[PDB]
């Protein structure tokens, strides 16, 4: 029981993560060679990763009942990477229980009214548990079409270097070497 005794303030805090839908991802890409052929994370492979963060499942204290999820700011959703002809052949449906009122729309036609952010919210929404926390978690996914967003100051940092920045890894290893100078 001692493992849990302590200050759990920072274990439950909301971290503001960031990812660009255009930056190549060696881990979430199916093409891994050559270096120039690596593609960004596909729609479903990016949503599968985000849904894991919104559920807080990346934390060692995850519990499905506690809403220990985090925020995820997705940028460049206009350049959402998709394979095949999904952009023009995939269809989204709707019905309000009135016979004949079946609304259909393609991915590209849906990206003209509400942009690529709406296509990613539907992918993440289906990957989340269908319960009373689905709308709270999906609201923590802030997707934008370009590189601009109001959370450029919220993104988690480490020594002034935003995570995902060019030199963010060096700033982390420098802070841990200073923490070892103690009993």
């Amino acid at each position: 029981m001692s493992q849990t005794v302590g200050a759990t303030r920072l274990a439950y805090s909301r971290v503001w993560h960031h990812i660009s839908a255009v930056t190549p991802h060696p881990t979430l890409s199916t093409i891994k060679a050559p270096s120039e052929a690596i593609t960004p994370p596909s729609l479903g492979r990016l949503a599968s990763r985000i849904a894991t963060i919104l559920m807080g499942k990346h934390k060692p204290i995850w519990d499905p009942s506690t809403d220990c999820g985090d925020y995820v700011v997705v940028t460049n959703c206009a350049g959402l990477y998709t394979t095949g002809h999904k952009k023009w052949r995939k269809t989204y449906y709707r019905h309000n229980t009135r016979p004949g009122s079946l609304q259909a729309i393609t991915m590209d036609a849906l990206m003209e009214k509400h942009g690529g952010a709406e296509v990613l919210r539907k992918a993440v929404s289906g990957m989340l548990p269908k319960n009373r926390l689905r709308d709270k978690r999906l609201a923590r996914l802030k997707a934008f079409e370009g590189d601009a967003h109001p959370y450029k100051e919220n993104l988690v940092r480490f020594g002034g270097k935003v995570v995902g920045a060019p030199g963010w890894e060096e700033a982390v290893k420098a802070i841990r070497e200073a923490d070892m100078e103690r009993l």
């Binding site: 302590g6 920072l10 060692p60 204290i61 923490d179 070892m180 100078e181 103690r182």
Partner: protein, 63 residues
């Protein structure tokens, strides 16, 4: 779930990767700096008296 045992399995979280690398045919001391905030009882080397022999280089420099 239906039973308290089935719930424990669904809510399982595996131990840290450092503990899985268990030695074989021998005992060893591995260095696992946790991703957590240290308490106040880990006095920094700057507050230790000059006489305290515990003053020593970082544990990383010992490996």
């Amino acid at each position: 779930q239906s039973t308290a045992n089935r719930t424990k399995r669904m809510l399982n979280i595996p131990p840290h990767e450092s503990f899985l690398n268990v030695p074989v045919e021998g005992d060893r001391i591995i260095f696992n700096p946790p991703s957590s905030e240290a308490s106040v009882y880990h006095t920094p080397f700057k507050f230790l008296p000059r006489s305290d022999p515990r003053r020593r280089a970082n544990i990383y420099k010992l490996f």
